[PDB]
Amino acid sequence: RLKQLEXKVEXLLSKNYHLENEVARLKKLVGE
Amino acid sequence: RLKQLEXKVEXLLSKNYHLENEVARLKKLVG
């Protein structure tokens, strides 16, 4: 169970970083 | 440990939902 939870943290973090990159890219687009 | 990890998963699910909302908002603005 611990390892499954650990894998979920890693997956969510990776997903989070992709969403942060996306947001930063979109902000360059608008000018904010 | 299980409780802290369960708490990190929830904390991260929440940031991701907030980030998905920003992406959607910025896309409306662009557009």
List CB contacts (< 8 A) between B9 and chain A: 5, 8-9, 12
Q: Of A16, A3, A14, which Cα lies nearest the Cα of B2?
A: A3
A24 touches chain B (CB under 8 A): no
Burial class, B1, CB count within 10 angstroms (exposed 0-12 / middle 13-18 / buried 19+): exposed
Separation in Å, CA B20 to CA A9, A23, A25, B7, B8: 17, 9, 14, 20, 18
What is the least distance, in Å, from the CA of B28 to any CA of chain A?
Answer: 10
Query: Using CA atoms, how far apart are residues A20 and B15, in angstroms rounded to an integer?
Result: 10
What is the least distance, in Å, from the CA of B20 to any CA of chain A?
Answer: 7
Resolution (A): 2.3
CA geometry: angle B18, A24, B26, nearest 5 deg:
60
Method: X-ray
Contacts of A2 (CB under 8 A, 6+ apart): B1, B2, B5
Q: Which two tokens stand for residue B5?
A: 């990890």
Q: Which of A2, A5, A29 sits opposite B30 (nearest CB)?
A: A29
